Design a protein around this ligand. Structure first.
Ligand SMILES: OC[C@H]1O[C@@H](O)[C@H](O)[C@@H](O)[C@@H]1O[C@@H]1O[C@H](CO[C@H]2OC[C@@H](O)[C@H](O)[C@H]2O)[C@@H](O[C@@H]2O[C@H](CO[C@H]3OC[C@@H](O)[C@H](O)[C@H]3O)[C@@H](O[C@@H]3O[C@H](CO[C@H]4OC[C@@H](O)[C@H](O)[C@H]4O)[C@@H](O)[C@H](O)[C@H]3O)[C@H](O)[C@H]2O)[C@H](O)[C@H]1O
Ligand SMILES: [Ca+2]
Length: 166
């Protein structure tokens, strides 16, 4: 029983994502207005996918004012107050030295936890942490942030997000 949906992108047809809000079920990809050189989001069919056949690729061509201005957010994430969850995801990048923050929070943008400013390498790694839903929310969000200046010119790949009751 996982709390998020389509965490490995397997429900989505391969291709460049043209509808950022609704093109990928289970995810919201929208880009901030300060980002003048838009990123490219692509669901890729690839043989080295960690799970299934597909991964999400994010190519960063430019940044805006804040790192959350290029982001992929899993939503809805269906939870229960007081319950401790395990977050697991796989990530790699085309070139060494990409930076990503993996976060979870509510619809008022309060965070329950994060893996902060993680270094991504050219080989798939798992990234994992635990968080507890500390308030009365039942529908929360899991924003991943890509808009760090270090990432300009790089492509970051993610797959296999699972948020599970501990
Ligand atoms: O304990 C957390 C703390 O850890 C420190 O180490 C770190 O330095 C802090 O940044 C961090 O604080 C938390 O930051 C995140 C954003 O974090 C990124 O931004 C800062 C970077 O330095 C850092 O590396 C990144 O991790 C905040 O989440 C964001 O909150 C804002 C709301 O703006 C304010 O509201 C609450 C207040 O606590 C914040 O300080 C203040 O900025 C949201 O901003 C809104 O975004 C939406 C668009 O949302 C969509 O895209 C982005 C994605 O997050 C979101 O899920 C999508 O739905 C716009 O409509 C609004 O214009 C804009 O206001 C951010 O979405 C949200 O991620 C934490 O609130 C903060 O505690
Ligand atoms: Ca997959």
């Amino acid at each position: 029983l996982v709390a998020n949906i389509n965490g490995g992108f397997e429900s989505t047809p391969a291709g460049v994502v043209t509808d950022l809000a609704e093109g990928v079920e289970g995810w919201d990809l929208n880009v901030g207005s300060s980002v003048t050189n838009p990123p490219v989001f692509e669901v890729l069919e690839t043989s080295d996918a960690p799970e299934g056949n597909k991964v999400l690729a994010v190519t960063v061509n430019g940044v805006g004012n804040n790192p959350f201005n290029i982001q992929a957010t899993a939503l809805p994430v269906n939870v229960r107050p007081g319950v401790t969850y395990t977050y697991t995801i796989r990530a790699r990048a085309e070139q060494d030295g990409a930076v990503v923050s993996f976060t979870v929070g509510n619809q008022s943008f309060d965070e329950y936890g994060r893996l902060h400013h993680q270094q991504i390498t050219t080989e798939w790694q798992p990234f994992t942490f635990e968080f507890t839903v500390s308030d009365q929310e039942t529908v929360i969000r899991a924003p991943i942030h890509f808009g760090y200046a270090a990432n300009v010119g790089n492509t970051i790949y993610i797959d296999g997000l699972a948020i599970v009751d501990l």
